[PDB]
Design an enzyme around this catalytic site. Structure first.
Site, mmCIF file in Angstrom:
data_model
loop_
_atom_site.group_PDB
_atom_site.id
_atom_site.type_symbol
_atom_site.label_atom_id
_atom_site.label_comp_id
_atom_site.label_asym_id
_atom_site.label_seq_id
_atom_site.Cartn_x
_atom_site.Cartn_y
_atom_site.Cartn_z
ATOM 1 N N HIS A 189 32.500 48.981 44.485
ATOM 2 C CA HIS A 189 32.064 48.767 43.079
ATOM 3 C C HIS A 189 31.583 47.322 42.844
ATOM 4 O O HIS A 189 31.050 47.086 41.764
ATOM 5 C CB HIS A 189 33.146 49.206 42.100
ATOM 6 C CG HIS A 189 34.347 48.326 42.022
ATOM 7 N ND1 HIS A 189 35.556 48.709 42.571
ATOM 8 C CD2 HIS A 189 34.581 47.168 41.354
ATOM 9 C CE1 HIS A 189 36.475 47.788 42.299
ATOM 10 N NE2 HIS A 189 35.898 46.824 41.564
ATOM 11 N N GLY A 198 40.289 40.899 37.599
ATOM 12 C CA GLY A 198 40.285 39.646 38.368
ATOM 13 C C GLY A 198 40.947 39.802 39.726
ATOM 14 O O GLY A 198 40.746 38.911 40.559
ATOM 15 N N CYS A 201 40.518 42.484 41.944
ATOM 16 C CA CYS A 201 39.800 43.391 42.884
ATOM 17 C C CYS A 201 39.351 42.579 44.100
ATOM 18 O O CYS A 201 38.831 41.449 43.940
ATOM 19 C CB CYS A 201 38.672 44.172 42.217
ATOM 20 S SG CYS A 201 39.361 45.453 41.127
#
Length: 182
Positions: free
Chosen positions: A41, A146, A148
């Protein structure tokens, strides 16, 4: 504070960079040579920023299992002038549960951040932001935006990268040795 944090710190100090795409800033784990991983993502393109420097992407592959299900891991090869320490011997060979894991994050928002998440379950299937996903690890910690790309470790193993959470649980994509044979 203890040998879990000692291992996590050794990985963060030598094997992470700050990656920036159009989708945000991410902790990025370097695995060997110029090869690193990031959550799919992040939408890695032709160009990425590595510690705020414009870097050409030589190759990017969004991994899927053999049933054509998302794994949420993108393997990136960076046009960088320096190699990562080779940490492939710290990757597990098979899907597993773990005790006493640490999640470590390094970004502008969260420098030198370490979280003891405790027990890690082989959760398996997750509908992640509406995308059917396999090989998910779960830990009972209220992870937030924050985190990931954050690295999940135990003593002596690098087991996953943080890809999401539901407010009460956090979720990582497994890292397996077989992803990084060359």
């Amino acid at each position: 504070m203890g040998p879990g944090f000692d291992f996590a710190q050794a990985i963060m100090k030598k094997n992470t960079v700050i990656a920036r795409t159009e989708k945000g800033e991410f902790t990025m784990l370097g695995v060997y040579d110029r090869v690193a991983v990031i959550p799919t993502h992040a939408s890695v393109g032709e160009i990425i920023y590595i510690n705020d420097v414009e870097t050409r992407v030589l190759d990017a592959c969004a991994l899927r299992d053999l049933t054509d299900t998302n794994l949420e891991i993108t393997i990136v090869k960076l046009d960088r002038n320096q190699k990562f320490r080779d940490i492939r011997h710290f990757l597990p060979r098979c899907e597993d549960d773990y005790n006493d894991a640490v999640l470590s994050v390094h970004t502008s928002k969260f420098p030198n951040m370490y979280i003891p998440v405790g027990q890690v379950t082989n959760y398996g299937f997750l509908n992640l932001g509406g995308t059917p996903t396999h090989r998910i690890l779960m830990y009972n910690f209220p992870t937030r935006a924050g985190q990931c790309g954050g690295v999940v470790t135990t003593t002596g193993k690098v087991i996953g990268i943080h890809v999401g959470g539901n407010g009460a649980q956090g979720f990582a994509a497994m890292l397996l040795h077989s992803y990084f044979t060359d």
